[PDB]
Symmetry: C3
Subunit: 469 residues, 3 copies
């Protein structure tokens, strides 16, 4: 702590008693000069003395200064002080809500000027931002409709500020906001993602990411408001601060059913995801793969469209060479594709074509047990495709079984039989028993109690030689 900070706190403690007496004067100017000093110390860019101001007893006074009858200069200074107390911890925000401030903020939305409207909508964002409890209380005193009508303003800083506040009102999942109040905001936010103000864009996107993070009826309401096509367009915005909330909202939509998913596909989301796989920022690449995995969990057509978009090769590259955070998402995408791909085998053949098999087995050795199971399940589907393809063509061999051995991947599957987790073990066993059965036959007589080993590892190499000369 700087010398200025220490000497500031020395000053304030010595000069707070007069400030408290000055804000209590009958002279309206005294009230105002005192309220300005309280606002200035609370506007301190670093370490506002919020708690010192609270225990001085003046928060009820400042809330009264927001009254109907009070001069606008005073309502604004007091609301700005109260805004900053409310930006602090939850306990500091409670002194403001318990003194009655929230209904007076809401009043200022009607009667204040553009500057008063800005301040009161900002304070309400700090209150709503604090907790689900305060967010709902703000909604419970009917803030929504006066907030919406502020968007027929054209002051940019006012719309910028109410957009941020709007996002705190939609934000939260346990519990969620009341849907019949926050849904009213969707026609406004649908227009706000066409703003040219970047900060307005950002908060509009976040607010839509929160509203779409809900059940089917929430996702449908977002599709009905014709929001998805512009969200997909913003996936190509040049700033990641827009990319991120937009990607998140699109990801939420594809947690829906196949109708929800097909909407974002028809507006071109697969092309956007492709180019987000090369984002310089790792959480974008991670979020993109997660999104894609929600799509490859859909229809064979929607799998086919993922393939048509040339998303298979980039997904393999990441699964091979990306940080574990992303590898685990790339594996979910390929494993979901493997699953639904059973009904159109050619999807699995193209995937095996592109070399998915070795990166799948490579990750069995470094993955947590959830990803091991998704990974085993992908290889199992690949083996399943191989076996029905084998019977169809009369083959003597499962060609995918052969590809999984030739990539080193079978001992890795075999070795996941040594897993504490019974699910893993039972799954790994059934893959070996079904497509690599020779690996479970002991090396000699099996009735003398001698060693049981997988027909010992130093097996002969190659079994077919061509005649070169």
């Amino acid at each position: 702590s700087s010398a200025a900070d220490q000497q500031f706190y020395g000053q304030l403690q010595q000069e707070l008693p007069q400030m408290v007496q000055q804000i209590n004067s009958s002279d309206m100017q005294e009230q105002l000069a005192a309220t300005v000093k309280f606002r200035q110390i609370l506007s301190r860019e670093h370490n506002p003395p919020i708690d010192i101001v609270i225990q001085s007893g003046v928060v009820p006074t400042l809330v009264n200064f927001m009254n109907e009858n009070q001069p606008e200069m005073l309502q604004l200074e007091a609301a700005w002080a109260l805004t900053n107390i409310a930006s602090g911890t939850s306990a500091q925000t409670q002194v403001v809500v318990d003194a009655g401030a929230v209904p007076l903020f809401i009043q200022l939305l009607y009667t204040g000027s553009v500057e008063l409207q800005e301040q009161a909508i900002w304070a309400l964002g700090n209150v709503a931002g604090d907790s689900t409890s305060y967010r709902d209380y703000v909604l419970q005193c009917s803030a929504m409709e006066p907030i919406l009508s502020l968007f027929n303003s054209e002051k940019v800083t006012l719309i910028r500020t109410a957009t941020w506040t709007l996002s705190n009102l939609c934000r939260g999942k346990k519990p969620q906001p009341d849907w019949s109040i926050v849904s009213k905001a969707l026609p406004t936010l649908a227009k706000l993602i066409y703003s040219f103000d970047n900060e307005t864009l950002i908060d509009a996107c976040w607010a839509i990411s929160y509203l779409s993070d809900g059940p089917a009826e929430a996702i449908q309401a977002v599709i009905d408001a014709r929001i998805p096509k512009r969200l997909v367009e913003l996936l190509s915005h040049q700033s990641t601060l827009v990319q991120t909330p937009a990607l998140r909202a699109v990801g939420n939509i594809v947690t829906g059913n196949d109708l929800h998913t097909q909407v974002v596909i028809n507006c071109g989301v697969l092309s956007a995801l492709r180019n987000l796989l090369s984002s310089p920022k790792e959480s974008i690449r991670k979020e993109a793969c997660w999104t894609i995995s929600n799509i490859t969990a859909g229809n064979t057509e929607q799998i086919q469209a993922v393939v048509d978009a040339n998303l298979i090769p980039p997904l393999i590259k990441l699964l091979e060479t990306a940080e574990y955070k992303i590898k685990k998402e790339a594996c979910w995408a390929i494993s979901n594709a493997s699953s639904g791909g059973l009904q159109r085998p050619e999807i699995i053949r193209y995937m095996v074509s592109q070399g998915c098999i070795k990166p799948l087995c490579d990750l069995l050795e470094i993955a947590d047990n959830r990803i091991i199971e998704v990974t085993l399940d992908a290889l199992e589907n690949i083996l399943k495709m191989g076996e029905t393809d084998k019977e169809a063509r009369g083959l003597a061999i499962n060609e995918n079984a052969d590809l999984i051995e030739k990539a080193g991947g079978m001992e890795k599957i075999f070795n996941c039989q040594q897993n504490e987790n019974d699910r893993i073990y039972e799954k790994a066993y059934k893959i070996i028993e079904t497509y690599f059965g020779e690996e479970l036959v002991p090396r000699g007589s099996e009735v003398n109690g001698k060693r049981v080993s997988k027909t010992s590892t130093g097996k002969r190499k190659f079994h077919k030689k061509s005649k070169t000369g």
Copy 2:
């Protein structure tokens, strides 16, 4: 891919249509010149264009060129082309078997000359090598007896080639080859391990390694053919390419009962194993320890013979300082010896003499849970030997318990009580409870809910001092 490869494939696509027309001519020379070009492109040392030749439709023609009535020059060129298609993938090998080639190969064994015999036996090795399915089909068309009678040849390249083919016919475990057909080969292979041709030796050994990798009746049939004594002699062959299949076959024999095991012991296998423990190649050392562990799982006499051969000290060295792959085999050998060694304690006393106790405990901390259990089981037997020795002599202490503490090994046992696996935990507990019970008594009062610790680690050092002066 080289410029030559690309320009080759450009050439072939442009000049394949005439080759196809030339092989279909009525003029026998045309047939032959065309068949020679198909053979030459398929004899390409790298990347034979097998699939291009298959989809050209000529495999039925080449199979017909192997007919009874056809000139030998043509049967040979066609069989050599078909040999090389059959050396490819399983799907490429199917085009050859589904066109009828295998019974005509077998025919060529009777009617062909020495060069035709060579080619057809080679093609049959590629077919048999492909899969159990094709191996059995080859056996199912009665190839075995015409193949055997080729060994009254004395062309070295013919015997070399049929020996390799023979090994593919015996090879495979799920399912195994028909035993009443492949057993017919054992009198021949018994003579073939006395060949001076190294490549014939190698394949003879591999074939015997496959036939002996079977139930008791297979192992007995190998002993009856007087094969074991020469297999043990080849353990000292100067090349590891002979050492390896021979060691594997001997290892298979000692998965039998005590009678099977005693045969290889009487022919001097313990001396051979000793000198294979110092093999410069790590898979030999690993296979040797595994072999020995099958022996130390036998009689007290067979344990006694392992000790008599001075195999204990080298097994301890490896268990101490070898790669985990080998350490785990050395531990199985010592742990099996510990188990049967109970009936003649002096075996366990000599083993403890040589310092087996510390390397056993050292590995408890780095082993998978299968090796931990074998390792705990060895130490348990060592403690069991100590306790019956203790009662016999009137001792106040289990001297082996004392040796296991003095080597740091008891806290390692104690700490395996923190094992996810109940078997481990339950086993480790019973060792501590039975031979280190003080380790389970809490440090003070046990009824006040205070801390429970193993009479805290900073115990006093030494408890008996000698009077020096």
Copy 3:
């Protein structure tokens, strides 16, 4: 082995037969000169030839030389030889006890001079030190009362030697010594911790550490003998060789109930523990934290006294930056304090004040599963305190929940849900479900089989901004 060692063993084997004949002579001088040589070779500072002397058959002779009728010079030389044989292994000690030596040692305590008393009490320490079996046998031949009466000596080397022997008689836990015999020693040891001889101090402390390592009745007997106040004083002895057995004995006392614990608190042990937290030797710091954890497992007053002693900050430092051995003890101390601290929340508030929350979560990722559970349990109590504090004050938020998220600690708790151990998993789950429930709500629709992720990790940062200008 030196040239001297080899040439010594060459000499002894050649010259042992006459020594054996010389010790059997009728001439008393011959007996004595022979007994002196046997004593000198057995007093060898390194590698006494104990076993060679045993198998020579002379141990019965040397035991007879301790008889009533024998000259004192001879009893002393023979007892000193027998002392050194008894300092060896348990099997070597048995030859001495089975020849009758122990009752003659005890006799020499009555009839010998000060030098004979020294020797026989030393030999008895070697016998008692060997095993519980021999320790009890020594007690069973009524050694205790003649040993105690040696402490009215004032020869320092005699008291030094009998103090060490006394500690071997009390030492041992499975089984323990007979309590109605070793308790007789407590009035003597209470005086012996006021000795100025450091070596007497050390063994007195160890002996008391063994006697106090017993049930409640043992701990009470130590408190009744007014031993605790001097043990706490010796915690500030300048040598760690006194610190260690004294700390151990004090630790044993606080495994008692609250009355036992309050005794060491009233004699100032908290100040001593504080300064032992900075001991340069790591086992002292470890033992000190363990001790403290037995105290923080007591009353709210005894927790309050730990806090009053300013032991909280040093315990956090270690939990943060000490070796895992000590971190695990510091965590037990803070977690016990957290538990009983529920009945006086201000203890938990001061602890959270000092920054215990981040070091607690930091260790969830590197701890074995016992320490993870103690650690989770501490955080759970901290969250429990937060929640009853929350309801009391009307807060919208659990401030401790907020502190645990802001320290990175919630994903660590969340991630311990991926634990093989059901206890861990079930505990970690209930913390998340109860105080971080939003973390278990999936990111979108939950009925379409899409991905289930914790409302994806790339959540927005901050949610309340202050108006700076």
